[PDB]
Amino acid sequence: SILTYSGGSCLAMAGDGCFVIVSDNRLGEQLKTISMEVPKLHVINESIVLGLTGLRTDQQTFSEKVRFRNELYKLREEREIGGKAFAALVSSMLYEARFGPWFVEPVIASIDKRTGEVYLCAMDLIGAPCEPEDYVCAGTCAESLHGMCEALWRPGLGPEELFEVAAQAMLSACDRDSLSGYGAVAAIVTRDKMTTRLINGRKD
Amino acid sequence: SYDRAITVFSPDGHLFQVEYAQEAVRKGLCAVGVRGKDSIIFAVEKKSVQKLQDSRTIRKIYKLDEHIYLAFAGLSADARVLVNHAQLECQRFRLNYEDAVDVDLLVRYVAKVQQKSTQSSGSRPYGVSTIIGGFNENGQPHLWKTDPSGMSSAWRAVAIGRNDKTVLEFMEKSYQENMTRDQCVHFAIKALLEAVESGSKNIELVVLENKKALYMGDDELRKFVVEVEKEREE
Amino acid sequence: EYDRGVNTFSPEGRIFQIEYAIEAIKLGSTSLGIQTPDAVVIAAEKRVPSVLVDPSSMNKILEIDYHMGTVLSGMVADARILVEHARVEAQNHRFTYDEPMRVESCALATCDLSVRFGLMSRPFGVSLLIAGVDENGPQLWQTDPSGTYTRYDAQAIGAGAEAAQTVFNEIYHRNMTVEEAETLAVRILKQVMEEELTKSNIEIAIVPASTGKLEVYDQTKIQRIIDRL
Amino acid sequence: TEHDQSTDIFSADGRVFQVEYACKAVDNGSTAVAACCTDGVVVAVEKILTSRMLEEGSNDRIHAVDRQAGVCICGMLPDGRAVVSRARAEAENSRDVFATPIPGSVLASRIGEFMHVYTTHYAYRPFGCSVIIASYADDGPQLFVSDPSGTVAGYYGIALGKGKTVAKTELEKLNFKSITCDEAVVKLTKILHDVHDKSKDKLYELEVAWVCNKSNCVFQHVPNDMI
Amino acid sequence: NQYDTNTTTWSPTGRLFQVEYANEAVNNGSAAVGTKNKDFVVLTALKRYQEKVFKLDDHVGMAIAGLVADGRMLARFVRTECMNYRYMHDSDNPLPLIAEIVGEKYQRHIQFAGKRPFGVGLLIAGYDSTGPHLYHTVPSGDVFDFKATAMGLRSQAARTYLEKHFESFPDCGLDELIMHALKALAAATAELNIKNTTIAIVGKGTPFMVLTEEAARKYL
Amino acid sequence: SAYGLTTFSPSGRLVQIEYATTAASKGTTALGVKAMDGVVIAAEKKTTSPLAASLTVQKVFVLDDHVGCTYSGIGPDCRVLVDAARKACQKYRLTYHEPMPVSQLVRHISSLYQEFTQSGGVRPFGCSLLVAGADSQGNHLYQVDPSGTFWAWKATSIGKGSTDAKTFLEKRYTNEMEIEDAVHTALLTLKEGFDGTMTAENTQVGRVSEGKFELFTVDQLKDYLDQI
Amino acid sequence: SSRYDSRTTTFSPEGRLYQVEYAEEAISQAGTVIGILTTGGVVLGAEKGVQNSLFDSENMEDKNISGEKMYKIASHIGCSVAGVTSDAYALLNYARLSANRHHYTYQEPMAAEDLCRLLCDEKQLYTQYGGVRPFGVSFLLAGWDRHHGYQLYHTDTSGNYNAWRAYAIGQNDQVAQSLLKRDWKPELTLDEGIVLCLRVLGKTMDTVKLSAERLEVAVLHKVPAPATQKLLEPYGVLPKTVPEFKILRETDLKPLIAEADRQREAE
Amino acid sequence: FDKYITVFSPEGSLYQVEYAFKAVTYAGLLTVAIRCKDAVLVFTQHNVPDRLMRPDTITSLHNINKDIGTCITGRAPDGKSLVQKARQEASEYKYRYGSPIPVSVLAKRVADMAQVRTQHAGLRLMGVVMTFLGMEQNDADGSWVPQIYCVDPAGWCGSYHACAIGKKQIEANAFLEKKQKNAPFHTLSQKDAAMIALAALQSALGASLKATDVEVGRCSVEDHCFRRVPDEDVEEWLTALAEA
């Protein structure tokens, strides 16, 4: 499969006026490992983080299109885009390419700066949104991420407990996956601050 | 889409759009080219010295490729378009034929771009003349001039723009075969100051040698204008 | 000038754009061709605008193909476009049927393109003498902005036209030699030129029936003709 | 008086002068008469001959457009001819696409629409003909005129061209409830022979066609032995 | 005159002026003549070496008068129509249909602003399953079917001569018919000979053909 | 015909744009007023005869749920812009799943006006718009002119009685008007310049409030007219 | 219809494009705009129309993207315009889109001269092709790139452009160049450069006290670089400083309208 | 220079539009439409000047589709061009939305077609007033209401209770204004509205009308189709008026 060629996984969870998003650091060509220092997270503005997985040429190209449109948005509109409009926009671009797709699967995580309400979205490769309240994930160890989060996640959590949940998840899931791994990077976002952490993991 | 016929004949074989394009060249600042043994010298008049103009002035002598320069007279914006097409053309040629375009070839490309603009419905002619100089890969210099009609031709030295005819007359007497690099600069500056007022910072100057080019500085150009202002009092 | 369009007819059935284009050719250099039985000869006045011009670069004689050459008069830059279509047609012929284009076909092909205007804004202000040898011996054809083309035993075009067509209705007989045409050529150039005549100041070419190749004369060999006068 | 150079322009009175002038071509062309009868339609035109050395059938003004329909061009003949080709495309269209011979009212409508459009664009000029349409399809005998404006009107009888004011006076003495195709061929030919001006146009012949129950509803020139 | 620049302007008396001027281009070309008997058509033309007679297919050709570049266009056009026809049918493009489509091509160039009139007249001569045919086309798009006529300069005189003789042409043989066509063309004038006069023929048994200088010697 | 109809004249003026502007100024009066919590726009709709049906004449238009407009000058030209505006709003929704901000919509109208001053074979739109809406940045009133120039206003008027309407609003306008007293002021300003008696059937009124634009029905507007 | 053609792209009998010339007159009628190059950045200042009580703000979430006359094009380029306002907005979209295409392709900021050339080529295109009027705009571009440092450009209706150390377009531009010529010098701070701009506007508006509500000022300068996200981008490298385009508010023009009135009384 | 194309004069007026309005009266005909309680009626002149014309072929009334009728006033062949575009518009609308175009929306689309020629150059304006007639359903109770819309060369679209268009429209519209004051048109019977309309014509033309001189169309709550009224039903209206 083509969505698994390059490797990688991403996960985002919500808490109470916070989220965490994590990605692994591996880039590959099927089983051959090219780099161990490629995190898949992109910061859009103070409020929005983008995760992309799938084929790396299309992650690289589709994030450059997102960046381009965002810059023009900011000059026309003289403001930052909100999490929900950014996701609707992303969706529109994936579906523009409905009969010849970008092989990416995005994970968007955001927070309304005013109301402190957290918006999560994940998309299939033609832009169908899946917007639950607990978590989202994508990439080569998404099956194994589901059950980690169903058993560790709980409503209400604050930044530091949400960070442990979300790091134990990513590590235990990457460790049963041959195409994602080499530890992780996590962004933790509140209305007030954005913390980043590089987490240690296995060297296989 | 606009398709009107702009350039047409009128009752005695006159194409007025072409004539008036050549009028626009006569009002433009003076430019000069002078072919030595193994160097070409392009020299142009700049508008006028100001305190405010930027010391690093914009250049009015353009590079078309590693071994071919262009100076012009006339509508400066039209010329910038023309220089673009010519830069594209040289690179297109490397891509289609691996070797580097010959000056004489590049001149016919440009001249045909000018000619087409005299016959293409929808469009007026460029208002530009060019002087294009460069080397073969056997090291022998060439200097060409192109005019708005699209006619090209090779010269040993040439002037265009304002006071074209006066400079050209001075140069018919004084020109000499196999001038050195320094003689060529001397002779080019001299030629210019028949049209121009002073020679402080209203002259830019390229010395195009085989395997080098120089946009002369203001230290070396002052040195030559005073060697030449001293000779004009005799 | 814009009061009436590019297509308008005059009250005596001429198209204005074409009349005016023909006037343009009159203000040209002078050029001519002469047909003997052995050969066909072409020549032109150069007319440089100073002694700083390298004269090589201002040719009014161009090879279309090994067996035919042209001399142009009127707007040189427009002629470049015709002479390029003709070079391409002559080579398409050889590509498709492995033999040289006839001279008449070449004149026909160059005239088709003359009248494509309404597309181009205006006619070409150009006339061409095409000269060459095929199977019908030495030939000389002339095209003009109307798109008429026509075969001639000897013609001239340009500023000195009307004066060269009274040195023709006198000295021109059908039955002359190479020599007498090469000399009659230079006789007419001397007449209707403004300058004094020199080896650098004129161009001469021949296509002899002997070999079927255009040859362009050196300045060494043009000395020999001014001498014979 | 710049208001009369393009037909894309009203004048200040609400007139379109380019269309008036084209109508003047028609009014100075040759005279045609037609009659819609019980059993069909008859048309007759007068051809002014420019030369005694024309073959017969030269510069025919009557053309078939379909098995059952024809037109008589009055005015400039080559303009008229472009109208004939459109009329045939329409007639063909109706058989191809809708499986029906075109109705006469519909064919006239489509001809009008066509002439109308050259009355509205700066780049074209009105046609310089009127077209008589004679049909006999499932809607029965019909006679329409279209003119350079694109106006279309049905008639019992009609006359165009220079003779038209007298010819109209004689066409008024007919009786359109009784008259047959056979009687009309006689009467219309008499009217063209009387309105003919002998000082000005010395050489002429008459053209005459019909679509009747006799001809098995086929439009066709009448056999030359009936004049 | 306000009304005589474009083709798309009627004049207040219902004239098209630019079209009459294109028509002068014809009245000022070199004369040509045509005539026909029961089974042939003859074209003659007074060359003023200028191509003035073209073959359009095995069974049809034409003489021109006026702007030659227009003649050549009309020729590429008819030639391509006849070939098409013979490819589709394996027989000859009928002559009435050639005349129609030439007429219509001309007409389109007199009704739009992006088209110029054609300043060239044709005499089309051919031969098909319904006999010989001689058509005249002029720049207004008119198409006459003649038993004899003339076009171009002084061609009125040619026309006058023909007017006295054409009634006899049905009965003539191919040799007298050719002579009548020459006395006519002569009447429009230096004298005729094999270096300035063309003769072409078409008819029963006879694909369209310009007589060579040899065959023409007999008549001239 | 693909040549420009709008050109520069020797002194730098673009006269076709000034004649168009002249036509937008000869139109029936319309005005707008921005309160602290809403916006109100209003317009005369007089018919030429009582044979016309009053109820079908529209002068105020909904462009989307959150924004509306009115115009003066050439009605039929206004429909082109209303149609373009209405489409651009739906287009923005499809893309971002939220209402197009009024500032963006007004820059879209502008650039459409501006097209028709440079494009070949077209004349300029002969109408000016008032646009009134609400978005995440609050409540807005903009005016756009045939040149394609727009300005944000607290209160303004366009059309024949507009120098006087604007004078009268200078005096009565405060930064702490409530929406009901802005409607009152709107109506009161129309009343001054109005020829004849002003009814609920020859006046039309729209109102932004609670983030929603809405025309007043005839009956709602009769309520506010018996109070003044 | 061809008889009603104006012939916008047709030379006239002296090698002169009248519509290019008349469009330049239109710019001379427009509000004054001044640019000054300093050692610490570029300053752009512009006069505004007269302030009606009834105007309002757009109330935009970000205040440093557009005033009445100053526009951001990208984070290292800004500008001011004089001439037909709607014409300026069409070209400013053109420039924003070109600057961002270049970032898309090379992932690096477009050089300010490269940007300026694309702008001017667009203008030249309506002078040669297309039967329509030209754009009636002149721009001043303030730029920073690593090739050439701070740069100030002027763009004229012909599609010509030139670099400057100080310049003025609009109404009283001869009076303004006269003053800059006298008082400019190559050692200016950015705070002095701002002052000098205010004096020059004070002497062209024709008032003794500088009304802060009739002035717009913007600065293209450098500021210390933000966060270095070495975890999300391990091969990211930012310089110490980056360019910013800033549209100074009234609270920053208070100590600077004060220093221009103490230099107005002591003269 | 503004008298010949779509540019503004210096008073912001469009001259080709004003002259297109003159084309409307130039044609010499008068039309009256009137909306009563249950129906909408249209009464146009049927002039057959020529004794040889087939009078059932001269008409100003046309169907746009089963349920919408028009009356053309002005330059007749410009009329028929708009009838064809209206028919095309109606047919596209029905294929796109699957229901027949409402008469209000039809009229607005035809108005937009006119407006576009006021703003682009090179196409002449149509010198007509199109009066559209038909029944429209209300959303509330699903009742059907008669409408009259007119579109003019400027691209203006408005609805009416009654209106005269064409030669002497000024005199006929005043007569209808007077007779509006007695009782609103929407309270009248078909017969009573008819007597008003017919007498508007007789007043204005300065004549007495026969049934052959008018053609009449009608849409009603009973039958929504636009249909011509037969000559007998019009003789009974003209008889009723000669009496009272």
UniProtKB/TrEMBL annotation, chain C:
Gene3D superfamilies: Glutamine Phosphoribosylpyrophosphate, subunit 1, domain 1. The 20S proteasome core is composed of 28 subunits that are arranged in four stacked rings, resulting in a barrel-shaped structure. The two end rings are each formed by seven alpha subunits, and the two central rings are each formed by seven beta subunits. The keyword Transport does not apply. It is found in: Cytoplasm; Nucleus. It comes from the Eukaryota. It comes from Trypanosoma cruzi. SMART domains: Proteasome_A_N. SUPFAM superfamilies: N-terminal nucleophile aminohydrolases (Ntn hydrolases). Belongs to the peptidase T1A family. This is Proteasome subunit alpha type. NCBIfam families: PRK03996.1 (NF003075). Its main location: cytoplasm. GO terms for biological process: proteasome-mediated ubiquitin-dependent protein catabolic process.
Automatic annotation (TrEMBL), chain D:
One of its GO terms (cellular component) is proteasome core complex, alpha-subunit complex. This is Putative proteasome alpha 7 subunit. Keywords: Cytoplasm, Nucleus, Proteasome. One of its GO terms (biological process) is ubiquitin-dependent protein catabolic process. It is found in: Cytoplasm; Nucleus. Pfam families: Proteasome (PF00227), Proteasome_A_N (PF10584). SMART domains: Proteasome_A_N (SM00948). Residues 3-25 form the Proteasome alpha-type subunits domain. CDD domains: proteasome_alpha_type_3 (cd03751). Belongs to the peptidase T1A family. It comes from the Eukaryota. The proteasome is a multicatalytic proteinase complex which is characterized by its ability to cleave peptides with Arg, Phe, Tyr, Leu, and Glu adjacent to the leaving group at neutral or slightly basic pH. The proteasome has an ATP-dependent proteolytic activity.
UniProtKB/TrEMBL annotation, chain G:
It is found in: Cytoplasm; Nucleus. The keyword Cytoplasm applies. One of its GO terms (cellular component) is nucleus. GO terms for biological process: ubiquitin-dependent protein catabolic process. Pfam families: Proteasome, Proteasome_A_N. Keywords: Cytoplasm, Nucleus, Proteasome. Residues 4-26 form the Proteasome alpha-type subunits domain. It comes from the Eukaryota. SUPFAM superfamilies: N-terminal nucleophile aminohydrolases (Ntn hydrolases). PROSITE patterns: PROTEASOME_ALPHA_1 (PS00388), PROTEASOME_ALPHA_2 (PS51475). The proteasome is a multicatalytic proteinase complex which is characterized by its ability to cleave peptides with Arg, Phe, Tyr, Leu, and Glu adjacent to the leaving group at neutral or slightly basic pH. PANTHER family: PROTEASOME SUBUNIT ALPHA/BETA. Belongs to the peptidase T1A family. The 20S proteasome core is composed of 28 subunits that are arranged in four stacked rings, resulting in a barrel-shaped structure. The two end rings are each formed by seven alpha subunits, and the two central rings are each formed by seven beta subunits. This is Proteasome subunit alpha type. It comes from Trypanosoma cruzi.
Automatic annotation (TrEMBL), chain H:
The keyword Nucleus applies. GO terms for biological process: ubiquitin-dependent protein catabolic process. Coiled coil: none annotated. Residues 1-23 form the Proteasome alpha-type subunits domain. GO terms for cellular component: cytoplasm; nucleus; proteasome core complex, alpha-subunit complex. CDD domains: proteasome_alpha_type_6 (cd03754). Keywords: Cytoplasm, Nucleus, Proteasome. The keyword Transcription regulation does not apply. It is found in: Cytoplasm; Nucleus. It holds the Pfam family Proteasome_A_N. It comes from the Eukaryota. The 26S proteasome consists of a 20S proteasome core and two 19S regulatory subunits. The 20S proteasome core is composed of 28 subunits that are arranged in four stacked rings, resulting in a barrel-shaped structure. The two end rings are each formed by seven alpha subunits, and the two central rings are each formed by seven beta subunits. The catalytic chamber with the active sites is on the inside of the barrel. The 20S proteasome core is composed of 28 subunits that are arranged in four stacked rings, resulting in a barrel-shaped structure. The two end rings are each formed by seven alpha subunits, and the two central rings are each formed by seven beta subunits. Belongs to the peptidase T1A family. The proteasome is a multicatalytic proteinase complex which is characterized by its ability to cleave peptides with Arg, Phe, Tyr, Leu, and Glu adjacent to the leaving group at neutral or slightly basic pH. The proteasome has an ATP-dependent proteolytic activity. This is Proteasome subunit alpha type.
